[PDB]
Each structure stands twice: as structure tokens, then as C-alpha cells.
């Protein structure tokens, strides 16, 4: 029906600025970055949509995408952020990728990291933001971790509530960085015998996806 995008983001435990780049420009926030990188590592890989029309001088959007209208948003807002996405799908190996096809209906995709601070195998996924929270063992602020607690649920709640929740529009974007110390160097999870955890996750941050009629 109408054009869509990120709208907003939350990760600082209190929402944050973004500022719609047309009239003004947002500057001078607390540039914490570590939480950004962590979120970006999800918000790049963990998508199944692409551009249709590549373009030059226009909005990278141009209502011109192939793939589901929750997952495409980040791609557009990250690509123009020089956060090379159609590259990174090939940077990592794509151990596995499960579609909608699981018990609580999520989608997930496991990838080995070639070279970054994070450990080798990485897990990323999405579903309802509440359902991410359900599986969150901690939250990530200032590039640390904090032990997730009622206070930190609250800080997410009021945020999600303000984002104007209705059902399954917003997304929860989390990881748990599959510990290559416990996990094997053969990473034979597959999509059949996975036997992986789904409930260690970090809250890292979220955005505010739309999916209007």
C-alpha cells in the first residue's frame, strides 16, 4: 500500500534518535558503536529479500524489492550505510538456514565468521519481539552485557509499546554467538538434527519494523 522503512530503533535501553534524513540530520548522540556492530551482524546476514531496481541518485528503496516486507527494511538502511550486505552473505559460509518451518514459527540461519571479534559459528534469527525477549538470557549496552531482569524487560516494553504494536510487525533481532569451545569444529547441525540451543540469546537491539496493510 504505502512506503515503509526502519522507522526507529531501540538498543540504548531507552530508544535512541535516528532522525529522518531529509530536512534535518541527527548528530552528537552517544556513539557507543559496539551494540551497533553486534546488531548490524544480525541486521545484515539475517534477511531474505533483495533490491529489484538498482538505482543511482534516488532513494535506494524506490518501492523496488524482491522478498518479505519485514526483512528488506534493514537491507536498504544498511547498504546505503556502506554496511555491505549482498557481500556478507558470501563472506560467511551459511552453515544452515531454516525458513518459517519450526515449532514456534521463527526463521534462523547459522554462519561461520571468517575473521571478526565474535566467535566462529554465529546464530541469528527473527520472530515477534516478545518471543525474542522470551529467549533473551542478557541485554547488551555500551558493548558489555547486563544480566537481563524485570527493569530491562521494562525498558524494552515501553519502547515496543511506543513503536505502536498491533501484532507481528516489529522484530526482536538477537544472537547468542555459538561458542566454538563447547561447539564442534565439524558444525554438523544441519536442518534435520540441529540439536542446537534456541534460548541463550542476547537482546542486542531492535528497530521497529512495519508491515501495514
UniProtKB/Swiss-Prot annotation:
Highest taxon of the lineage: Eukaryota
Residues recorded with modification Phosphotyrosine: 160
**What's the family?**
Belongs to the cation transport ATPase (P-type) (TC 3.A.3) family. Type IIC subfamily.
Tell me how the protein is altered or processed after translation. Answer: Dephosphorylation by protein phosphatase 2A (PP2A) following increases in intracellular sodium, leading to increase catalytic activity.
Entry comment describing in which tissues the protein is expressed: Expressed in the central nervous system, in most motor and sensory axons of the ventral and dorsal roots, as well as in the large motor neurons of the ventral horn (at protein level).
Task: Name the source organism.
Answer: Rattus norvegicus (Rat)
Its gene? Atp1a1
Shown chain mapped onto the complete sequence: 383 to 595 of 1023
Residues bearing Phosphoserine? 70, 102
Q: Where in the cell is it found?
A: Cell membrane; Basolateral cell membrane; Cell membrane, Sarcolemma; Cell projection, Axon
> According to its UniProt entry, what is the function of this protein?
This is the catalytic component of the active enzyme, which catalyzes the hydrolysis of ATP coupled with the exchange of sodium and potassium ions across the plasma membrane. This action creates the electrochemical gradient of sodium and potassium ions, providing the energy for active transport of various nutrients. Could also be part of an osmosensory signaling pathway that senses body-fluid sodium levels and controls salt intake behavior as well as voluntary water intake to regulate sodium homeostasis.
**Quaternary structure per UniProt?**
The sodium/potassium-transporting ATPase is composed of a catalytic alpha subunit, an auxiliary non-catalytic beta subunit and an additional regulatory subunit. Interacts with regulatory subunit FXYD1. Interacts with regulatory subunit FXYD3. Interacts with SLC35G1 and STIM1. Interacts with SIK1. Interacts with CLN3; this interaction regulates the sodium/potassium-transporting ATPase complex localization at the plasma membrane.
Protein name (record) = Sodium/potassium-transporting ATPase subunit alpha-1
Binding residue positions for ATP? 105
Amino acid at each position: 500500500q504505502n512506503p515503509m522503512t526502519v522507522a526507529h530503533m531501540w538498543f540504548d535501553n531507552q530508544i535512541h534518535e535516528a532522525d529522518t534524513t531529509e530536512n534535518q540530520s541527527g548528530v552528537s548522540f552517544d556513539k557507543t558503536s559496539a551494540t551497533w556492530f553486534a546488531l548490524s551482524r544480525i541486521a545484515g546476514l539475517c534477511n531474505r529479500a533483495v533490491f529489484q531496481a538498482n538505482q543511482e541518485n534516488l532513494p535506494i528503496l524506490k518501492r523496488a524489492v524482491a522478498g518479505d516486507a519485514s526483512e528488506s527494511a534493514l537491507l536498504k538502511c544498511i547498504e546505503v550505510c556502506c554496511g555491505s550486505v549482498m557481500e556478507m552473505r558470501e563472506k560467511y559460509t551459511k552453515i544452515v538456514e531454516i525458513p518459517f518451518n519450526s515449532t514456534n514459527k521463527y526463521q534462523l540461519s547459522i554462519h561461520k565468521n571468517p575473521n571478526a571479534s565474535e566467535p566462529k559459528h554465529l546464530l541469528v534469527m527473527k520472530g515477534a519481539p516478545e518471543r525474542i525477549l522470551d529467549r533473551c538470557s542478557s541485554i547488551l549496552l555500551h558493548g558489555k552485557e547486563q544480566p537481563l531482569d524485570e527493569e530491562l524487560k521494562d525498558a524494552f516494553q515501553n519502547a515496543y509499546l511506543e513503536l505502536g504494536g498491533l501484532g507481528e510487525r516489529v522484530l526482536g533481532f538477537c544472537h547468542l554467538l555459538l561458542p566454538d569451545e563447547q561447539f564442534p569444529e565439524g558444525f554438523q547441525f544441519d536442518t534435520d538434527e540441529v540439536n542446537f540451543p534456541v534460548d541463550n540469546l542476547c537482546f542486542v537491539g531492535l528497530i521497529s519494523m512495519i508491515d501495514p496493510p
